[PDB]
Amino acid sequence: FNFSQILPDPSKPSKRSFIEDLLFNKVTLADAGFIKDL
Amino acid sequence: GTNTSNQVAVLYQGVNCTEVPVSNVFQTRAGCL
Numbered sequence A: 001f002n003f004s005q006i007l008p009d010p011s012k013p014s015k016r017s018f019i020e021d022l023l024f025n026k027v028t029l030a031d032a033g034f035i036k037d038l
Numbered sequence B: 001g002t003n004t005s006n007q008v009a010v011l012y013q014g015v016n017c018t019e020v021p022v023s024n025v026f027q028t029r030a031g032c033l
């Protein structure tokens, strides 16, 4: 059984795995930084 | 909690506190420590 896609890839910048990254990008939401949606 | 000591530390919520900090400054994604 090849759990390649789900198991976190070390080379990937974010510790997120292939499937995890795809998910995050789809939802249009990324508040990078909180020093202050509008 | 007063039962141990009476020293406390301060946190400002939204500030580039390098700039408007109004000893021992230290910058966090959550503000000024």
Ligand SMILES: *[C@@H]1O[C@H](CO)[C@@H](O)[C@H](O)[C@H]1NC(C)=O
Residues within 6 Å of the ligand: A035, B016, B018, B019, B027, B028
């Ligand atoms: C605070 O302001 C300085 C001014 O250049 C900037 O370099 C620094 O990144 C700022 N702090 C944050 C957390 O963005």
